[PDB]
Structure formats: C-alpha cells, structure tokens
C-alpha cells in the first residue's frame, strides 16, 4: 500500500531543508527494449500543477496570434527569427500550431537539444490556444522513456498537502500501464523508487 | 548436560502419570462418590501428570499450551522428530534434547516415550520451572540460528586423521 510510506503524502515534508518549491519524482521500473516506438509514448494532463516556471515562445500566425494577449506567458510571431537561432535561451518549453510547418526546420540546432522544441512526441504543436492554456501553465508531468529501463517524471510538490495530491499519483499510474505496448513484461509496477529532490527515497 | 538433566528428572520424578494400582484406587473412590455423593468426576482431584505421546505433544505445541518439551536424541526414523525443534522455535515453546529415550520411558513407566511435555505444574516449583526454562533457553532456543547454519560431520577415522596431520605438518610447515 502507498499509505504507510509517503509516496505523495504529508510524511516527507520536513526531510528536505530547502524552503523552495521542491518537486517529487516517480520512477517506473520494467525491462523494455532499445527501440524507439516501444514504451509509453504519451503525456496526459496532470490534474494538480507541478508548480514550475515556464514561458512559451508562441510563434503563431494570423488566426492564432490573438489569444495570447489574455492568458499566456509571452507573445511572439514568425518575424522574430534572428533571436531564437543564435543567442537567446530564456525559455522552458514552447507551443506551436499546424498553420506554420515551414519555420520548424530553422530552429533545430539550438532548441531540439535541451527540450525547448518539438520533434514528434509531446503535444507542443497543438492548434487550440483558447482552452489548452489552462493545462500548460498548470505544469504537467514529463513521460519520456530512456534507453534501457528508467522513466523519470514529476508528479507534484512535497510541501503541497495530501488533499490535492491524492488523485495525482493514481491517475499517473493508469497512463504508464494501460496505453503501454505488449513488449513489456509482467508486473509493470515492480519497483517505484520515489524521491523528491533532497530527502531519502521512499519506495512501495 | 548432567546437571540440568538432574534437575529436570527431579522435577519429573515429582510428576509421573497414574499407574494401574493408583487408577484402581481412584476408581474405587469415584465409585463410592458417584454412588453416594453423585459428583460427576468432581470428587476426584485435578491431575497434574506429564503430557506424553508424540501426536499428543505435537498437538499441544500447535495449540500453544505446552510449557516445556523434552525431545529424545533418537529413533532412526528421525523424520518423527526433526520437525520438533522447528515447531518449538516457531511457537516459542522451550525445548531440550535429552540423551536417551529410555529415561523418558522410566519417568512415564514405558519402554520408550520419545517426547515429554509439561503443560501443568503445581505451585510448588514455579521458580524451579522458570530456572530450568532459563537454562534450556540459554542452551537451545537462543542458539537456534547458529546451529541452523552449521554443517556437522566430516570427522575422519583416527588412522586417516593422524595421516592427514602428519602430511599437513610435513607439506606446509617443518
């Protein structure tokens, strides 16, 4: 049971001495392959926010560069091109659309590396900018499968009480388990080494 | 050892089961009592004999009611008795491995007995019972994991042992 240990709860709140927003990280454990189409390639909505700071480089076009002046972080265009290829790195993740698919071949050498752009896996080029902005400023998780076997993500914050963080670790267990390929083994919940950023590790 | 077995067999000389003549005596007494006072086996006193019999003693250990259990160091169908140290360790009952099942027979008036068990005791020797429990748990129950991990056997005959001693003395040292 996840109730005797902390795993999202009140029990690990004074173990870390930093009084800053320190977030919890859950690792799923199951042997997989080395190929790239296997694994759980999906990033759902995280219901309670991760409480992270992120600014969006919305390089939009005619029909979509108007809904950024109400509920967004930064308002950009496609004309500002000589900045995001050479020098500036003041961003966490961007957000684009399908209307401009010819500007994507330009911002490859600087933003594809540290996860500031999109290749094929995360829902970054989503067209709707009037409803999906109540889901990305409330920072989601990050489901990204690595080479052999580790799955490092982020659920919530340790200083947040166990009332908001009670259906967040449970909805996240139902994403890396059911949409997964039939290339995984038995007991997809075998080991869950869960440590936030500073304290000890609490496992199931 | 000889001393703890001496104290244990003093305590069991105090506690022997009823023989045939004593049974005939209590049969005459309760035959008078039921015919006259109509006491339903209650004019007789409550017994305090040793418990014995292997299914008897194993069932008493399973039901957590045995105070002390003596175990023999014997019969070659040892499948009878190798699970008694593990039962007595699992169920916390102290257990001692007394030498020879024949002394167990003489304290119970049989030829052999192969087990012995106290569940009751009169109030005379509670302290002696606790002292024997302490001594036996110093000898057996606390030392269970140590003897559990070690392999006995491998002792050679003295001729080949002396030959090995000469060879290991003259091939390694001078």
């Amino acid at each position: 049971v996840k109730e005797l240990l902390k795993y999202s709860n009140e029990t690990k709140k004074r173990n870390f001495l930093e009084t800053v927003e320190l977030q919890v990280g859950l690792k799923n454990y199951d042997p997989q392959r080395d190929k790239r189409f296997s694994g759980s390639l999906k990033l759902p909505n995280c219901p309670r926010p991760n409480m992270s700071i992120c600014i969006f480089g919305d390089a939009f076009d005619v029909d979509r560069a108007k809904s950024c002046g109400v509920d967004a972080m930064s308002v950009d265009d496609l004309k500002k091109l000589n900045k995001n290829k050479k020098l500036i790195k003041k961003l966490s993740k961007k957000y684009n659309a399908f209307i401009a698919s010819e500007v994507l071949i330009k911002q490859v050498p600087r933003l594809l590396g540290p996860q500031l752009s999109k290749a094929g896996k995360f829902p970054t080029p989503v067209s709707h900018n009037d409803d999906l902005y109540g889901k990305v400023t409330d920072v989601r998780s990050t489901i990204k499968f690595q080479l052999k076997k580790v799955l490092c993500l982020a659920v919530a914050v340790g200083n947040v009480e166990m009332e908001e963080d009670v259906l967040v670790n449970q909805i996240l267990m139902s994403v890396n388990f059911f949409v997964s390929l039939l290339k995984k083994n038995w007991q997809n919940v075998g080991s869950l080494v869960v440590k936030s950023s500073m304290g000890p590790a609490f496992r199931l | 050892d000889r001393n703890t077995a001496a104290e244990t067999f003093k305590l069991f000389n105090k506690y022997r089961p009823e023989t045939a003549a004593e049974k005939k005596e209590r049969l005459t007494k309760e035959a008078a009592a039921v015919a006259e006072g109509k006491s339903k086996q209650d004019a007789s006193p409550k017994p305090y004999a040793v418990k014995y019999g292997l299914n008897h003693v194993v069932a008493l250990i399973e039901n957590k009611k045995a105070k002390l259990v003596l175990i023999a160091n014997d019969v070659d169908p040892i499948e009878l008795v190798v699970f008694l140290p593990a039962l007595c360790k699992k169920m916390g009952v102290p257990y001692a491995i007394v030498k020879g099942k024949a002394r167990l027979g003489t304290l119970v008036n049989q030829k052999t007995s192969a087990v012995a068990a106290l569940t009751e005791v009169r109030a005379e020797d509670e302290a002696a019972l606790a002292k024997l429990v302490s001594t036996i748990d110093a000898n057996f129950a606390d030392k269970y994991d140590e003897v559990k991990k070690h392999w006995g056997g491998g002792i050679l005959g003295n001729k080949a042992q002396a030959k090995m001693d000469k060879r290991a003395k003259n091939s390694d040292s001078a």
Partner: protein, 203 residues
C-alpha cells in the same frame, strides 16, 4: 498429530536431510539380507495410511528387488521364430517390481497375508520396499471386524493373483473408457466377446 509433518517431509525427497537419510538407509539395507524382517516401519505416515495398526500380528518385511529389464530366456538370443518376436534385451515385463517384492515375501512367510507395500528406497542397482503383511491366524486380527476380512479364505495370496493396490494397478483395473482392454479383468472381457453366443430360437 504429526503424521502430516512426516507426510510433508517424506514428500520432499531430494533436500539435504532426506538425501542424507536415504544414503544412510540405502547402505543400511544393502548390508543386510535380501528379504529380512523390519521391526518397525521407516515410514509410519505411509504405513499407517495403508492399514498398519501397530499391534500384534502386523509384521513389516523389507525387500531388495533387482532393477532393470527382463532379459528374455531361450538361450543365446536365438528365439527360433519370426523376426518380430526376436527381442532379448528390451523386453519390459508387465508386472511391477513392487509386485515381485510382495510376491517374494509372500512366498517366504506363507502363513501370513499381504496387505500393501510402499517404496522406501532406490539406488541404481535395486529397489527397496517394505511390505506390510498381516498374520491372519493371530487372534487379535481374527476379532475386531475391521480386520477379519483377511481371515476369509478367498484372500489367500492377494499378492500373487494381483489383488493389492499395485496388483489392481498392474492388471489395468479402473473405471473408464480408457480401460477397455480390462475394466472387469482382461481375459473375461476377452472371452465374453469372442464367445459366439447362440440361442434356442435363432435370431
């Protein structure tokens, strides 16, 4: 009781305790005679559930049978016939070795009657059994109606005619569609269907 515990010990036969005991006992029996008296069972859990009551008349014998294939006689392999029936080495003898053990102790102690038998041991060269013979003329067996059925003289030599637990096996007797060579014995159901049954008024 404790026969559940002996039962579960006797099931695990290749752990270090039972292979030690099996090696001591295999030496212990390989230095005694071929058929010799066992004063007490070595498997009271198995002996008691076959019908052992430890009282007077029940005797336990212990018996070494040789272990392998029945090499056919008719000497030097010349079998004098069709080359179908020409095997000598690979013929494999419809009776069990458990039946030869019971039958040999029934030929030795012939005043007694055999109840069952059980395995105790096997090495490469031999199988070792204990046989649980009953003495029928002993007055403890003749009374107490659970055990007087061995007194009835239709049970002379249960071990020879195939009547024990293993004789009723080696004869192929059960119920079932799989047992149609023999369900009621083989030869009766042979002769019952190679009979050309006729009647008075020919149908």
């Amino acid at each position: 009781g404790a026969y559940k515990y002996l039962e579960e010990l006797q099931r695990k036969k290749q752990s270090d305790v039972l292979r030690f005991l099996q090696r001591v006992r295999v030496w212990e029996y390989r230095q005694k005679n071929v058929i010799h008296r066992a004063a007490r069972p070595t498997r009271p859990d198995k002996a008691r559930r076959l019908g052992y009551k430890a009282k007077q008349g029940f005797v336990i014998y212990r018996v070494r049978v040789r272990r392998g294939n029945r090499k056919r006689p008719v000497p030097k392999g010349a079998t004098y016939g069709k080359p179908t029936n020409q095997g000598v080495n690979e013929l494999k003898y419809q009776r069990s070795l458990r039946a030869t053990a019971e039958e040999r102790v029934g030929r030795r102690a012939a005043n007694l009657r055999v109840l069952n038998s059980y395995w105790v041991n096997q090495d490469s060269t031999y199988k070792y059994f204990e046989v649980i013979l009953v003495d029928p003329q002993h007055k403890a067996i003749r009374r107490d109606a659970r055990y007087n059925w061995i007194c009835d003289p239709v049970h002379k030599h249960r071990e020879a005619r195939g009547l024990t637990a293993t004789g009723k096996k080696s004869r192929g007797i059960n119920k079932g569609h799989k047992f149609n060579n023999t369900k009621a014995g083989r030869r009766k159901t042979w002769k019952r269907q190679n009979t050309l049954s006729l009647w008075r008024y020919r149908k």
